[PDB]
Amino acid sequence: MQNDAGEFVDLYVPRKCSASNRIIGAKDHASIQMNVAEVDKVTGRFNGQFKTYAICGAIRRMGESDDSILRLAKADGIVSKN
């Protein structure tokens, strides 16, 4: 990442999976970046703000992308507690 000079010496910082915290590879074509919308507290309309989740190929193939999205949505307060 950083040499003793100070400057960052790298092509690009890769995205880590929101679920498993593994590096999403360059040619990870089964990897997903899903945007979930934010509602206005009163009216319940798409204000413009959104919250992004990234899932790697492994978690998609396993079939645990569903529970991973759900539990992230629960944690971030998109899905109601219980």
Partner 1 sequence: PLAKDLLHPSPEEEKRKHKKKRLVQSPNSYFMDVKCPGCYKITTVFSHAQTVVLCVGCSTVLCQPTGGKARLTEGCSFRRKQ
Partner 2 sequence: EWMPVTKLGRLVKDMKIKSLEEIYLFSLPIKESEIIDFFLGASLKDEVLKIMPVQKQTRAGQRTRFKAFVAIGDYNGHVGLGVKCSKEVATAIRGAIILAKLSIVPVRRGYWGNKIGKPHTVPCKVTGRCGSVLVRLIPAPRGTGIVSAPVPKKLLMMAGIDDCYTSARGCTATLGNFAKATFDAISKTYSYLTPDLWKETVFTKSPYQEFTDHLVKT
Partner 3 sequence: SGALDVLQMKEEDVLKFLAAGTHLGGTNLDFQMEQYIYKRKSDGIYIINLKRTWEKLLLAARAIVAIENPADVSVISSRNTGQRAVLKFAAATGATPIAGRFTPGTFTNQIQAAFREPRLLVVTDPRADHQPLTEASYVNLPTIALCNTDSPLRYVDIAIPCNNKGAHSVGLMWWMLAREVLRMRGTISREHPWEVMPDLYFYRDP
23 binds partner 3 (CB under 8 A): no
Q: Which of residues 22-51 bind RNA (CB under 7 A)?
A: 30
Choice between 16 and 61, CB closer to RNA: 61
The per-residue b/e assignment along 57-81, b for 16 or more CB within 10 angstroms, e otherwise, is: bbbbeeeebeebbeebeeeeebeee
Closest contact distance (angstroms) between CB of 64 and RNA is 10
Is the distance from CB of 16 to CB of 22 less than 8 angstroms?
yes
Among 22, 64, 73, 79, binds partner 1 (CB under 8 A): 64
DSSP state, 9?
Answer: -
- Binding residues for partner 1, rule: CB under 8 A, are 64, 67-68, 71
